[PDB]
Design a protein around this ligand. Structure first.
Ligand SMILES: NCCOCCNC(=O)[C@@H]1CCNC(=O)/C=C/C(=O)N2CCC[C@](Cc3ccccc3)(C2)C(=O)N[C@@H](Cc2ccc(-c3ccc(C#CC(=O)O)cc3)cc2)C(=O)NCc2ccccc2CC(=O)N1
Length: 163
């Protein structure tokens, strides 16, 4: 399974590195989309974009590198792509899952859970997990709010593939 990283800052101050294992063994098309958007190998991707919606005791959401507000994004497949499967469940903090706007509307937006979000099972495609840097995710969460608006600008300063 691929390992990728997000290096995250808040108002320019580094928070540290999140390492994510992508479950290509279960959701290969979804994992590949995220992997490629982390490396930037297609000329676009997550580098420089933000965590735009962060809600404590829920999740941290990112990946809208076109509109920076939860309305945008773009997949590597030329169109919104189908839900690959709903095998993996939102079991707890650190789960990596695809944001969407309903069935078969996967693009680039994603979220990292900070709690078991079981009510999203069967609605959002889970495709990875945090293996290092859950404390960084908790710091991101620390800058969220009930509305999800962040109290600092949370930026993916760098991202890429490790293995
Ligand atoms: N137990 C029930 C109570 O539980 C309490 C906890 N709260 C929850 O469980 C809440 C309760 C319900 N409130 C919300 O849904 C929050 C919504 C929200 O904030 N909007 C702010 C951002 C825009 C909106 C509406 C919208 C506007 C324009 C276009 C689409 C939607 C709304 C929104 O919906 N944008 C989505 C994220 C999204 C993701 C992908 C695309 C997309 C995909 C592909 C391409 C391409 C291509 C190509 O060409 O390749 C382009 C774009 C567009 C939008 C959103 O954010 N989805 C919400 C979400 C996200 C992640 C995880 C979970 C949830 C559910 C949740 O948050 N659920």
């Amino acid at each position: 399974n691929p390992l990728v990283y997000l290096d995250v800052d808040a108002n320019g101050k580094p928070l540290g590195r999140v390492v994510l294992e992508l479950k290509a063994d279960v959701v290969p098309k979804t994992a590949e989309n995220f992997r490629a958007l982390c490396t930037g190998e297609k000329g676009f991707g997550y580098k420089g974009s933000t965590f735009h919606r962060v809600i404590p005791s829920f999740m941290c959401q990112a990946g809208d590198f076109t509109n920076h507000n939860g309305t945008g994004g773009k997949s590597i497949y030329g169109s919104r792509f189908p839900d690959e499967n709903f095998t993996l469940k939102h079991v707890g903090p650190g789960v990596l899952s695809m944001a969407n706007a309903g069935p078969n509307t996967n693009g680039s937006q994603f979220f990292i859970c900070t709690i078991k979000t079981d009510w999203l099972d069967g609605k959002h495609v889970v495709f990875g997990h945090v293996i290092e840097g859950m404390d960084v995710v908790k710091k991101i969460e620390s800058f969220g709010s009930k509305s999800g608006r962040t109290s600092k600008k949370i930026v993916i300063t760098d991202c890429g593939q490790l293995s």
